[PDB]
Write an enzyme that holds these catalytic residues in place. Structure first.
Site, PDB file in Angstrom:
ATOM      1  N   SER A  74       0.830  -1.202   0.000  1.00 14.33           N
ATOM      2  CA  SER A  74       0.000   0.000   0.000  1.00 14.33           C
ATOM      3  C   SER A  74       0.859   1.244   0.000  1.00 14.33           C
ATOM      4  O   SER A  74       0.303   2.299  -0.259  1.00 14.33           O
ATOM      5  CB  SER A  74      -0.967   0.087   1.177  1.00 14.33           C
ATOM      6  OG  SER A  74      -1.843  -1.034   1.220  1.00 14.33           O
ATOM      7  N   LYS A  88       0.854   4.039  -2.650  1.00 20.31           N
ATOM      8  CA  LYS A  88      -0.243   4.999  -2.664  1.00 20.31           C
ATOM      9  C   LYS A  88       0.187   6.340  -2.073  1.00 20.31           C
ATOM     10  O   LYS A  88      -0.468   7.358  -2.322  1.00 20.31           O
ATOM     11  CB  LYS A  88      -1.482   4.576  -1.873  1.00 20.31           C
ATOM     12  CG  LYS A  88      -2.045   3.219  -2.234  1.00 20.31           C
ATOM     13  CD  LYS A  88      -2.935   2.588  -1.175  1.00 20.31           C
ATOM     14  CE  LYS A  88      -3.604   1.331  -1.766  1.00 20.31           C
ATOM     15  NZ  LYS A  88      -4.522   0.685  -0.842  1.00 20.31           N
ATOM     16  N   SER A 121      -5.658   4.199   2.630  1.00 15.56           N
ATOM     17  CA  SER A 121      -5.219   3.035   1.889  1.00 15.56           C
ATOM     18  C   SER A 121      -6.431   2.432   1.135  1.00 15.56           C
ATOM     19  O   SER A 121      -6.563   1.211   1.034  1.00 15.56           O
ATOM     20  CB  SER A 121      -4.602   2.042   2.885  1.00 15.56           C
ATOM     21  OG  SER A 121      -3.473   1.357   2.366  1.00 15.56           O
ATOM     22  N   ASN A 163      -8.623   1.173  -1.691  1.00 13.91           N
ATOM     23  CA  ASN A 163      -8.235   0.506  -2.940  1.00 13.91           C
ATOM     24  C   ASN A 163      -8.913   1.108  -4.188  1.00 13.91           C
ATOM     25  O   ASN A 163      -8.229   1.352  -5.190  1.00 13.91           O
ATOM     26  CB  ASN A 163      -8.260  -1.023  -2.881  1.00 13.91           C
ATOM     27  CG  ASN A 163      -7.177  -1.594  -1.987  1.00 13.91           C
ATOM     28  OD1 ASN A 163      -6.034  -1.133  -2.020  1.00 13.91           O
ATOM     29  ND2 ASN A 163      -7.491  -2.620  -1.200  1.00 13.91           N
ATOM     30  N   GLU A 195      -3.940  -7.086  -6.798  1.00 13.10           N
ATOM     31  CA  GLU A 195      -3.050  -8.159  -7.202  1.00 13.10           C
ATOM     32  C   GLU A 195      -1.587  -7.781  -7.004  1.00 13.10           C
ATOM     33  O   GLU A 195      -0.721  -8.634  -6.950  1.00 13.10           O
ATOM     34  CB  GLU A 195      -3.400  -8.594  -8.635  1.00 13.10           C
ATOM     35  CG  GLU A 195      -2.478  -9.674  -9.180  1.00 13.10           C
ATOM     36  CD  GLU A 195      -2.679  -9.787 -10.687  1.00 13.10           C
ATOM     37  OE1 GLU A 195      -3.371  -8.880 -11.204  1.00 13.10           O
ATOM     38  OE2 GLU A 195      -2.210 -10.730 -11.344  1.00 13.10           O
ATOM     39  N   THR A 208       1.995   3.421   5.260  1.00 10.45           N
ATOM     40  CA  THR A 208       2.309   2.014   5.539  1.00 10.45           C
ATOM     41  C   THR A 208       1.975   1.115   4.347  1.00 10.45           C
ATOM     42  O   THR A 208       1.267   1.490   3.420  1.00 10.45           O
ATOM     43  CB  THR A 208       1.421   1.557   6.695  1.00 10.45           C
ATOM     44  OG1 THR A 208       0.095   1.907   6.268  1.00 10.45           O
ATOM     45  CG2 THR A 208       1.819   2.195   8.006  1.00 10.45           C
TER      46      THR A 208
END
Ligand SMILES: *C(=O)N1C[C@H](NOS(=O)(=O)O)CC[C@H]1C(=O)NC1CCNCC1
Ligand SMILES: [Cl-]
EC number: 3.5.2.6
Length: 267
Positions: free
Chosen positions: A46, A49, A106, A108, A145, A212
């Site tokens: 993550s 991002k 975080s 998606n 993925e 993170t």
């Protein structure tokens, strides 16, 4: 002397949890640095991002995008772990809300949405990093993925060093102009997912911006941070871990400890 002691403690930390710790940590004030496995590849998870957030702010600055333009996706079936995008499904988000949410939560859906419409996919993201002189960063796949963290896999990896230098450039340097830079800083400072990582390693009144990453395979977890100690030039810390067996859990505490050791090394 301290460098030497820091690397003994790190290598004993990686022995203790049976995997692999990568660190780079920089004082932007004294130019002392500490590096352990700092040129190995680890999965990004993550953590990328946080760089996507910056990529978005650069397009705004160039004026290809407005930070307040509305981004709509009623159509869209949200990705697992889209805590923020799901609640705004009916109304749309502003671009700047979406981006922060990718970073701070975080989220998606926010991640994939932004890469699909605004950044040209994972090779666009990759291309953005190349454009700031980072030759190690690679994004190959989309959420979710990109999190497989398979051993010996190049995809969706970077190095501890490259992450550190990149964050340095993005957060503290001259890629983002003055106002846009302030925003990215505030977004990293607002991250909500970091309280057990690099933030646990530092005093309460130090200011910390972080991102993170938790792949959730091979116990792969990481954190990078800008740290402003009161009356001091910021430090950049960058900590990437993997573990040997696939089903091993990530270790918040190994990260926070490696941070402690790295900062004492470079302080
Ligand atoms: C990122 O590494 N993610 C997204 C999310 N936030 O990560 S954190 O480090 O900011 O806490 C949680 C887990 C992770 C992710 O998407 N992992 C997948 C979970 C579902 N399938 C396996 C990997
Ligand atoms: Cl699908």
């Amino acid at each position: 002397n301290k460098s030497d002691a820091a690397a003994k403690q790190i290598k004993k930390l990686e022995e203790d949890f049976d995997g692999r710790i990568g660190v780079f940590a920089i004082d932007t004030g004294s130019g002392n640095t500490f590096g352990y496995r700092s040129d190995e590849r680890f999965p990004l998870c993550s953590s990328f991002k946080g760089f996507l957030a910056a990529a978005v702010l650069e397009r705004v600055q160039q004026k290809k995008l407005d930070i307040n333009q509305k981004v709509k996706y009623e159509s869209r079936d949200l990705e697992y772990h889209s805590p923020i995008t799901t609640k705004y499904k009916g109304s749309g988000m502003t671009l700047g809300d979406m981006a922060s949410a990718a970073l701070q939560y975080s989220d998606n859906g926010a991640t994939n949405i932004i890469m699909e419409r605004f950044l040209g996919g994972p090779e666009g993201m990759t291309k953005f990093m190349r454009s700031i002189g980072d030759n190690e960063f690679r994004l190959d796949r989309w959420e979710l993925e990109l999190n497989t963290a398979i051993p010996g896999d190049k995809r969706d990896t970077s190095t501890p060093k490259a992450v550190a230098n990149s964050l340095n450039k993005l957060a503290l340097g001259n890629v983002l102009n003055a106002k846009v830079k302030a925003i990215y800083q505030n977004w990293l400072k607002g991250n909500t997912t970091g309280d057990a990582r690099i933030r646990a390693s530092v005093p309460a009144d130090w200011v910390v911006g972080d991102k993170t990453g938790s792949c959730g395979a091979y116990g792969t977890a990481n954190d990078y941070a800008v740290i402003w100690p009161k009356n001091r030039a910021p430090l950049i810390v960058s900590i990437y871990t993997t573990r040997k067996s696939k089903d091993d859990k990530h270790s918040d505490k190994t990260i926070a400890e490696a941070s402690r050791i790295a900062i004492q090394a470079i302080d």
